[PDB]
Ligand SMILES: Cc1cc(N2CC[C@@](CO)(C3CC3)C2=O)cc(C(=O)NCc2cc(F)cc(-c3cnn(C)c3)c2)n1
Ligand SMILES: Cc1cc(N2CC[C@@](CO)(C3CC3)C2=O)cc(C(=O)NCc2cc(F)cc(-c3cnn(C)c3)c2)n1
Ligand code: PRO
Ligand code: PRO
Ligand SMILES: O=S([O-])[O-]
Ligand SMILES: O=S([O-])[O-]
Ligand SMILES: [Cl-]
Ligand SMILES: [Cl-]
Ligand SMILES: [Cl-]
Ligand SMILES: [Cl-]
Ligand SMILES: [Cl-]
Ligand SMILES: [Cl-]
Ligand SMILES: [Cl-]
Ligand SMILES: [Cl-]
Ligand SMILES: [Cl-]
Ligand SMILES: [Cl-]
Ligand SMILES: [Cl-]
Ligand SMILES: [Cl-]
Ligand SMILES: [Cl-]
Ligand SMILES: [Cl-]
Ligand SMILES: [Cl-]
């Protein structure tokens with residue numbers, strides 16, 4: 018049973034919800050967590066979705082080593098260094114991948130010779146290690162995390178860019194379609210883009226309870242920069258060697274954290290039906306003074322009937338726990354639909370169904386069960402999305418000048434402001450908002466750009482930048498961030 | 500095009516077959532290889548097979564960290580040690596997992612409380628690192644390898660043992676059913692079993708060209724030994740705490756290497772149809788003086804028709820390569836069936852189909868194509884298995900005394916001998932066969948137990964051990980090994 022309230026101590030609530038639902042286990046090496054099956058099933062589901070999608074684009078899976086030489090890694094210049102095999106020292110220390118550009122792109126340079134070798138599209142599912150000495154957050158910021166990283170190479174910048182955008186659309190569907198989390202597509206500022214890339218696009222999500230934006234996933238136009246560092250060139254049909262144009266793109270188990278925080282409530286997790294490993298839990302009522310065999314046999318029949326409609330069903334027929342215990346047990350784990358069946362329902366040929374998001378209950382004839390539940394699941398999914406979408410739009414203030422920033426941040430909101438996109442102005446804004454935040458804390462940090470949204474509201478003609486007074490260039494989404 | 504002959508220089512042949520088919524790429528850190536998509540597709544296929552199978556047994560996937568503390572790892576006492584994060588030294592060095600017993604079993608000890616928590620069945624797909632200073636072999640012996648490792652805990656030894664055996668049967672199907680490689684189920688000797696386990700079972704495969712057995716996969720009865728080291732105990736319904744009985748079991752991309760060596764020929768790879776990512780390659784003949792649009796449209800029709808029968812088809816319609824080039828290109832990559840379509844076939848409403856294993860050609864009406872190809876693929880699969888099975892049984896000599904050992908080993912054969920199973924005798928046999936091998940080499944190493952087969956031939960009553968003269972206990976399979 019969860020006891021911390023989501024709107025009071027968000028940290029403790031989140032810890033309780035992910036521990037008591039058996040999603041996370043702690044580990045003696047700080048910054049790493051055990052991902053138990055209840056969470057891993059959701060990861061498997063979104064991984065299957067995305068893997069199918071990119072296979073339709075011709076992307077193929079592969080596996081590159083987890084180690085990279087100091088030489089290949091410093092060819093492009095929080096990295097963990099292997100230095101010893103038990104007793105023996107290594108002749109040269111090797112790094113564990115924080116990302117695989119420097120591991121893969123030498124191979125790319127060998128494999129790409131002609132324009133007929135392009136496009137080259139590879140992906141891998143693995144973990145990477147980014148070893149920060151700061152305190153971790155389960156799912157959101159961990160020292161090891163599972164991800165996928167795709168890396169493509171094209172004959173033209175425009176083809177590479179169209180791919181960047183197609184992948185960003187897949188990430189939007191990953192979050193919005195599967196996880197029911199609303200996100201904002203945008204471009205990262207020059208100061209925040211991937212090191213060595215040309216243009217970094219992102220989908221951004223929002224955590225209302227602490228007011229923070231989080232980078233949900235990233236799709237980079239690398240252009241020819243990595244091609245120059247690794248000499249990845251192809252021949253046209255005329256014989257002139259030309260640099261390939263590259264992309265890389267990544268998304269991680271951070272997505273699970275974002276789903277939990279988005280949909281959970283004071284009773285615990287709420288899993289969108291499209292990724293719940295158990296969509297319907299069947300709880301028979303098991304009075305001592307009843308035909309228990311009949312009740313359980315009807316539960317098995319209903320399970321078969323629902324699974325023919327591709328509904329994922331579990332029966333909890335344990336005699337040693339009361340139905341109230343089971344109600345709370347599966348609410349904590351976030352199963353979206355609970356189906357109750359006792360002697361009265363049997364005599365009436367109906368079932369009682371309770372939805373996890375609102376607690377609304379329905380009485381459904383057995384004949385109508387599968388089509389009704391299907392409808393109900395799509396209604397839960399959509400409702401989880403729309404409410405989250407509402408909380409997103411309520412969390413964003415459109416402003417015009419800088420003294421509107423601090424009030425908006427004290428309301429745990431993001432700000433959408435006309436910006437000149439000068440990089441020096443961004444670092445000045447970060448340091449001033451941090452100092453203003455510290456001074457406020459004394460009476461009881463920093464705001465950064467999150468993204469330059471693709472969906473730009475109207476820009477009146479003479480509009481000026483909210484911090485420098487110079488001509489505004491575009492609306493930019495700022496806030497505190499993970 | 501492959502140029503080394505499989506029966507002459509096996510090493511060079513194997514290197515050519517896996518490089519020229521685009522399965523492997525080399526890497527600047529010795530002992531690690533890049534797994535390119537042509538190989539990774541096969542890994543994905545066998546992973547899907549095994550994952551589905553163990554999900555039917557109630558095993559669930561998870562993910563534990565790749566790091567383990569020195570303390571937890573030396574709790575049970577080729578390990579790579581992380582000692583630094585860039586500049587900063589680690590307070591205590593951490594190891595990269597060579598296996599995950601010491602990572603997972605503390606969590607098990609926390610999670611298991613009551614008999615109602617058992618059985619606990621977890622699996623993970625990841626890589627591990629076993630850092631030997633010896634020279635690697637692609638797929639077979641690498642310093643990093645992808646695998647799966649499953650770890651279960653049960654209330655009784657007999658339940659754990661039945662699980663060990665069920666998994667070993669899945670490994671037999673992994674090799675024999677999917678990869679068409681024949682294997683021998685057996686028990687490992689006391690000297691060769693998993694450190695700290697009670698009984699190690701294995702499936703063993705055989706490489707005729709060098710005479711070597713290889714441990715294809717492993718399923719361990721751990722018993723209560725790890726339960727004692729990690730204090731994993733459960734309460735019965737009476738309240739007495741009792742040690743759980745455990746298993747662990749593993750299988751790796753070594754399986755791909757074994758498939759390559761088993762089925763390949765002088766032209767390159769031969770991929771069993773059940774794991775070929777391309778089962779049928781359609782090669783249109785494209786004379787300049789023909790209706791090319793018609794020919795290609797019929798190839799697309801045939802592709803659609805075959806894929807409705809769940810056949811995996813690729814069309815190679817590249818105009819810049821001759822059909823002879825394409826024939827060799829897809830033979831090298833081991834596609835099992837090639838389908839040729841030109842103007843004459845079109846006018847006759849037939850197609851020409853050539854099978855990769857024997858080169859036999861067929862003329863098939865379009866209407867019969869899908870059922871005929873299905874039949875053909877099952878005939879290739881079975882034939883690849885049966886011939887490999889024949890080469891296995893020809894590679895094993897049943898012997899009765901020790902001076903039959905060296906002749907049998909010089910024929911690149913394994914030996915099946917009555918053994919007393921004394922462990923000291925095994926190490927004596929290893930050292931004597933090694934010395935005999937070295938002395939023979941001078942005129943131009945060691946034989947170990949491979950397994951004690953489940954399928955025991957008859958044991959005449961007074962039979963004596965082939966090395967010590969004492970009463971034989973069981974027939975044991977010995978040979979040189981990887
Ligand atoms: C799960 C995850 C995802 C991503 N990222 C980054 C890339 C991206 C973005 O979309 C996606 C792959 C492309 C993503 O998901 C980055 C990290 C991460 O930086 N981990 C290290 C770490 C450990 C730690 F204990 C503490 C902190 C820490 C504490 N305070 N601060 C400011 C940091 C950081 N972790
Ligand atoms: C792919 C793979 C599989 C397995 N194993 C072991 C377990 C098993 C068996 O079934 C399965 C998981 C349970 C399996 O597949 C073990 C290795 C391995 O020992 N790697 C290290 C290494 C690297 C290296 F460069 C050279 C050598 C080397 C050279 N000479 N010698 C005598 C060794 C060894 N590698
Ligand atoms: O780490 C990143 O952000 C990029 C995208 C995935 C691979 N490298
Ligand atoms: O390494 C091994 O042999 C066992 C089985 C997989 C996990 N540990
Ligand atoms: O465990 S998988 O996602 O690499
Ligand atoms: O790449 S997967 O097999 O962990
Ligand atoms: Cl938090
Ligand atoms: Cl999987
Ligand atoms: Cl652009
Ligand atoms: Cl949507
Ligand atoms: Cl970034
Ligand atoms: Cl249950
Ligand atoms: Cl209760
Ligand atoms: Cl009821
Ligand atoms: Cl509720
Ligand atoms: Cl755009
Ligand atoms: Cl917006
Ligand atoms: Cl070899
Ligand atoms: Cl996959
Ligand atoms: Cl036994
Ligand atoms: Cl078989």
Ligand SMILES: [Cl-]
Pocket residue numbers: 691692693699717
């Ligand atoms: Cl072993």
Ligand SMILES: [Cl-]
Pocket residue numbers: 813814815816
């Ligand atoms: Cl092709």
Ligand SMILES: [Cl-]
Pocket residue numbers: 823824827
């Ligand atoms: Cl040729």
Ligand SMILES: [Cl-]
Pocket residue numbers: 784839840841844851
């Ligand atoms: Cl022909």
Ligand SMILES: [Cl-]
Pocket residue numbers: 855856857858
């Ligand atoms: Cl042939």
Ligand SMILES: [Cl-]
Pocket residue numbers: 953
């Ligand atoms: Cl047995």
Ligand SMILES: [Cl-]
Pocket residue numbers: 683952954
């Ligand atoms: Cl045998």
Ligand code: NA
Pocket residue numbers: 477478479480481488489490
């Ligand atoms: Na303006």
Ligand code: NA
Pocket residue numbers: 959960961962963970971972
């Ligand atoms: Na005997």
